């Protein structure tokens, strides 16, 4: 329990969700590039509030906490790699082993009882795709398959990306990711006009609630997720009136893009096609504290050889990473930092009043709230707490 | 006596008390009575260098005197947080009034 | 309450006062001058802890809350006027009336259940002697004149002036204002020498404790505050001595000024005459958050005719906005600074030891206790209270 | 209580010393050297987290707290020491004895009935070897000596040292210093190699509990200490290893230094000998506030005449000052800080999972909870709280 | 000087007693004893004949201090400083006070 037992006992319907400010444990989560992290050179990170330090040894991953069980400590403060297999706090000189995390040897007391007999937690890392996932959990991972989109592991698929950090709770950003009005603050975007995309302003919902979307429960590999189908019944707003009158008119393009828009436990999104009509986008907005996200965003792009992944790594870099990565999802980073002062208190999860095209986000509420595999609390972060 | 160590007699400790038995060239032992029954762990608390024959029995759960960590002294599992390393738990016999307690652990 | 129960059930005196650390609901406040607000161009402020949006549409001025219903951002973030008489949030583009703050449109559904059957807070406006002044406040606002001290309004009374924020709680300014012995503070004032004023170290008071003030309850538009009547039977101190020895004298100067010091609620202090015998001086300490006030400093003098109110405005802008409200008040705002730390915790309320000039603040702290219309409360900031349904 | 009750109910063995994050009241502190306050110049800090004035009147040192009685202002913003002996509050010219905090006058109201009836508390202040301490607490005194270490008052005793405040609880700064294993950090100080120190990588203890340190609660002039013995009957490791391979060397020098450590409250460590074999390290973690502690870094060396102390200063200014308060303990200001977040949200006191060498760090965390003078908690700071039966 | 009468307050109850230009008295009765101390609180300018009696325990309405109206000790926290007591007799049911 993240938030007071009141605001808890009044969303009901999705009060996991409302709790989980620090995220769901017991997912993979995209933290790096592979290329980011070199043989022998350590890096940090925070994921779902917990310090951590990864490394590459004979090319495998290995992911411990970055803290002392002495006296808490970060490793990383003054890293001390001895041996190719351990690491050794710059303090006392504790000395673990990166492949189970053993308290192996003590450099100032090699006499100690404590040799042999403590563990420094460590997580599972896998590499897919040029991107470092970690299993933030405890036990034997599930297979990564599970915590992507569908699509984004095919053979063929060519992965691109760009990761920065970004002063939002990760569910605002999820929110925004799938709000399907949200669009509003694209439509002066100069992805638009210079890929000529069409883009509406908004949607008039068509249909029953339930054909909003597809809560998707029944995946052979156990995604969880929800597609967004507010374009099959409902109509898309290209000229937005005050009192009949036209203020604003949508994107008139010949491109159609992001058709098949669906969230994903443990939360990431994907746009087919996007930002054009051969490419679809992957975006996670991974929690690193109460307050923080990495904006995780891939693009994909099926290549058959060389010629066209190299093809490919070069409009990526000189067209889509400029113009749709920064040019257009610039906008999504301002919005959901607009959002942190009225969800700060837990408040905005009671006081927000939401309209018709909020079903998407209401169903992902209600899908996070029940197929998550764990709430990170504090007691995660600082240590586990029990009285007999 | 090196497979079996003489502590004390069965009647020479009152149900709910602690004895600490040093061995010479090894860490200490706590033999617990609980009821009638006794049970024996490392004396050396698994999260650091506190004495558990310091602590606290209550019933079959000894709290350590340094962070308020305990352990269940029949199994040596965990009882309180800090605490997360299983005790050594070592065989005692009562032969003919007597508490002998092993040198040597349980294989974990 | 904004404070802990430990404390207000201690100060039985005056505890709403201490609980009114946002400051009184229900009462009008000035922001700014007219003059800083364009037809059209409208302005962010932050009034007891609410932020708002001002716009002037046909030359009159409207009130927003500055948070959009659906998601509780800022429509500030992106002003998005996109006709004479609406704003659009720049988000999901719910689109409001200034006049009204009703929903009106939603530009990404113009089918949904929400259009009409939504409002967004609103707050009454009224320029007066060229001030802006907002009513914080819920239903049909009061005359204005109930929370402006006597002679504000008096249509020969040319009021010039200026504002500021000021990094301190908006009762430790209040407080500062109206304190009869903090002449000690100004005594090295360029006003004092430079204007010939006499102004005592303080007063040694006589007389019984109600006689040290005149407690107005009586007032035919309803106006609530406290006039200092130390000097009625009072000794002006004007030889400071330690140990018998004389280490400080006071201003022996001519010109007499403040023969007449009122606070009133809101929060406004009344100096007259000040800083010269033609003139007297209204200062409010308008409450932004519990750290922060405008100081809305202004100079009233009466002006029959169109030659003396040109007159004035030259020596305002030469003499006394300089030499008074900056070489004499500018002493009044780090001194406010400088009990911030005491009242921080809320104990200061309690550890302070008041001396006999402090009856002046009692009566106020009383009045404010009994006459305010009430108390703002975080609740009303993240807007859980008296909004539409 | 400045800790979570449930945190104090689990740490038996410590918890007054787990409670005293504001540091033990009714102890002597150096805060300043000698020569840094000069005759009538008051000069400000804050000591367990009280703000204070000190100033030096005939040569003699006095200390106010920075805080007037009357609305709880800091003196020190406006100083106006208007007689020799006196401080008068630049607000409304409240006028305090030095010597012993009377409310003498009043120049705003000279006939107040509060004139002789309240006291600005005041700290005794005794200069030694150049240092400024403060007697944080209430009442008499005792001798400095009993809250210095060893040797530091000795009459041939040439005391150098440097202060800076260091943001760590003074508690991690105490810890880091007396812990045995920590010299691992020092392994590559500059200092090790240009003064030719022999320095083990740590220590295999031997002996039982009671041999690892030597508790001094029985000293003449009722000292309270402890003394690290891990060297007398443990190993000096000099060859680090990992899976049985050499990793590390210790350093192989002639000069012994650092053989007898011992920390004093109210959190002062002496290492003798240090950096060099003729001479004494004195050094005080002394609590600020909960975040902040001046690190007070003393040099002892006997000195019998003006000769060898102007060589010795000489050697202070040109090698020991760069090269051991600076080139070996600035390891010891990052390891202090490097402990914060653990320690921050008090959670650190039940986490840490203590070695062996940590058998000194745990006897003066009871020898400090059962030899304290009194835990300083925030009502000494804002003003004590008591309700009647 | 004459106050009151035995019978003329209650157990529980305050009475101000204001003097021929002097700093006003407090007179309180505790069951059926009559004490006289200041009427001004030593921790700033309140009237303690304005505040809440709690059997031997005057609390001032400023700010919640408190005395003993017996000894005049400070009971409560803001006060530190001792309230004067003042010497009291009532002869044929006529509360006087020195
Ligand atoms: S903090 Fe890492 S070994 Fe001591
Ligand atoms: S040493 Fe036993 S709980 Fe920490
Ligand atoms: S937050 Fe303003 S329209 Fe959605
Ligand atoms: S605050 Fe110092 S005299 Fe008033
Ligand atoms: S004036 Fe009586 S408690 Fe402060
Ligand atoms: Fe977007
Ligand atoms: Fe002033
Ligand atoms: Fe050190």
Same mark, same amino acid.
């Given at each position: 329990?993240?938030?007071?037992?009141?605001?808890?006992?009044?969303?009901?319907?999705?009060?996991?969700?409302?709790?989980?400010?620090?995220?769901?444990?017991?997912?993979?989560?995209?933290?790096?590039?592979?290329?980011?992290?070199?043989?022998?050179?350590?890096?940090?990170?925070?994921?779902?509030?917990?310090?951590?330090?990864?490394?590459?040894?004979?090319?495998?991953?290995?992911? !411990?906490?970055?803290?002392?069980?002495?006296?808490?400590?970060?490793?990383?403060?003054?890293?001390?790699?001895?041996?190719?297999?351990?690491?050794?706090?710059?303090?006392?000189?504790?000395?673990?082993?990166?492949?189970?995390?053993? !308290?192996?040897?003590?450099?100032?007391?090699?006499?100690?009882?404590?040799?042999?007999?403590?563990?420094?937690?460590?997580?599972?890392?896998?590499?897919?795709?040029?991107?470092?996932?970690?299993?933030?959990?405890?036990?034997?991972?599930?297979?990564?398959?599970?915590?992507?989109? *569908?699509?984004?592991?095919?053979?063929?698929?060519?992965?691109?990306?760009?990761?920065?950090?970004?002063?939002?709770?990760?569910? !605002?950003?999820?929110?925004?990711?799938?709000?399907?009005?949200?669009?509003?603050?694209?439509?002066?975007?100069?992805?638009?006009?210079?890929?000529?995309?069409?883009?509406?302003?908004?949607?008039?919902?068509?249909?029953?609630?339930?054909?909003?979307?597809?809560?998707?429960?029944?995946?052979?590999?156990?995604?969880?997720?929800?597609?967004?189908?507010?374009?099959?019944?409902?109509?898309?707003?290209?000229?937005?009136?005050?009192?009949?009158?036209?203020?604003?008119?949508?994107?008139?393009?010949?491109?159609?893009?992001?058709? $098949?828009?669906?969230?994903?436990?443990?939360?990431?999104?994907?746009?087919?096609?996007?930002?054009? *009509?051969?490419?679809?986008?992957?975006?996670?907005?991974?929690?690193?504290?109460?307050?923080?996200?990495?904006?995780?965003?891939?693009?994909?792009?099926?290549?058959?050889? $060389?010629?066209?992944?190299?093809?490919?790594?070069?409009?990526?870099?000189?067209?889509?990473?400029?113009?749709?990565?920064?040019?257009?999802?610039?906008?999504?980073?301002?919005?959901?930092?607009?959002?942190? $002062?009225?969800?700060?208190?837990?408040?905005?999860?009671?006081?927000?009043?939401?309209?018709?095209?909020?079903?998407?986000?209401?169903?992902?509420?209600?899908?996070?709230?029940?197929?998550?595999?764990?709430?990170?609390?504090?007691?995660?972060?600082?240590?586990?707490?029990?009285?007999? | 006596? @090196?497979?079996?160590?003489?502590?004390?007699?069965?009647?020479?400790? @009152?149900?709910?008390?602690?004895?600490?038995?040093?061995?010479?060239?090894?860490?200490?032992?706590?033999?617990?009575?609980?009821?009638?029954?006794?049970?024996?762990?490392?004396?050396?608390?698994?999260?650091?260098?506190?004495?558990?024959?310091?602590?606290?029995?209550?019933?079959?759960?000894?709290?350590?005197?340094?962070?308020?960590?305990?352990?269940?002294?029949?199994?040596?599992?965990?009882?309180?947080?800090?605490?997360?390393?299983?005790?050594?738990?070592?065989?005692?016999?009562?032969?003919?009034?007597?508490?002998?307690?092993?040198?040597?652990?349980?294989?974990?």
């Amino acid at each position: 329990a993240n938030v007071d037992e009141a605001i808890l006992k009044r969303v009901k319907g999705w009060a996991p969700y409302v709790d989980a400010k620090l995220g769901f444990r017991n997912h993979w989560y995209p933290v790096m590039f592979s290329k980011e992290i070199n043989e022998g050179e350590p890096k940090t990170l925070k994921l779902l509030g917990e310090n951590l330090l990864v490394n590459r040894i004979d090319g495998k991953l290995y992911c !411990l906490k970055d803290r002392c069980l002495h006296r808490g400590v970060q490793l990383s403060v003054k890293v001390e790699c001895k041996t190719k297999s351990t690491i050794t706090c710059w303090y006392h000189a504790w000395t673990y082993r990166w492949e189970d995390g053993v !308290l192996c040897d003590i450099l100032t007391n090699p006499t100690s009882a404590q040799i042999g007999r403590q563990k420094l937690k460590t997580y599972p890392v896998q590499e897919a795709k040029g991107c470092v996932f970690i299993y933030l959990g405890d036990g034997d991972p599930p297979p990564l398959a599970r915590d992507t989109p *569908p699509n984004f592991l095919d053979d063929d698929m060519e992965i691109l990306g760009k990761n920065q950090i970004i002063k939002s709770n990760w569910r !605002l950003a999820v929110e925004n990711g799938f709000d399907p009005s949200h669009i509003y603050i694209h439509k002066d975007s100069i992805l638009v006009k210079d890929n000529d995309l069409a883009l509406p302003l908004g949607f008039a919902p068509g249909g029953d609630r339930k054909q909003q979307t597809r809560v998707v429960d029944d995946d052979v590999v156990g995604r969880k997720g929800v597609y967004d189908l507010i374009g099959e019944h409902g109509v898309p707003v290209f000229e937005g009136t005050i009192g009949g009158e036209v203020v604003r008119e949508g994107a008139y393009g010949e491109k159609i893009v992001a058709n $098949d828009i669906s969230i994903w436990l443990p939360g990431v999104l994907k746009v087919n096609p996007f930002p054009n *009509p051969d490419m679809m986008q992957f975006e996670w907005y991974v929690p690193i504290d109460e307050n923080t996200h990495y904006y995780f965003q891939t693009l994909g792009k099926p290549c058959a050889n $060389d010629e066209e992944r190299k093809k490919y790594e070069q409009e990526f870099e000189s067209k889509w990473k400029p113009m749709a990565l920064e040019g257009f999802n610039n906008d999504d980073i301002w919005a959901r930092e607009a959002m942190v $002062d009225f969800y700060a208190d837990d408040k905005g999860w009671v006081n927000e009043i939401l309209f018709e095209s909020d079903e998407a986000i209401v169903a992902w509420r209600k899908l996070a709230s029940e197929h998550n595999q764990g709430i990170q609390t504090q007691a995660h972060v600082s240590g586990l707490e029990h009285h007999h | 006596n @090196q497979i079996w160590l003489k502590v004390c007699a069965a009647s020479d400790m @009152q149900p709910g008390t602690i004895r600490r038995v040093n061995r010479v060239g090894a860490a200490p032992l706590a033999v617990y009575r609980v009821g009638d029954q006794f049970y024996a762990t490392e004396d050396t608390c698994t999260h650091g260098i506190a004495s558990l024959s310091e602590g606290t029995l209550d019933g079959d759960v000894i709290e350590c005197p340094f962070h308020g960590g305990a352990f269940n002294v029949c199994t040596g599992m965990p009882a309180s947080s800090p605490c997360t390393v299983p005790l050594g738990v070592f065989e005692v016999e009562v032969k003919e009034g007597e508490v002998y307690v092993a040198g040597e652990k349980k294989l974990e």
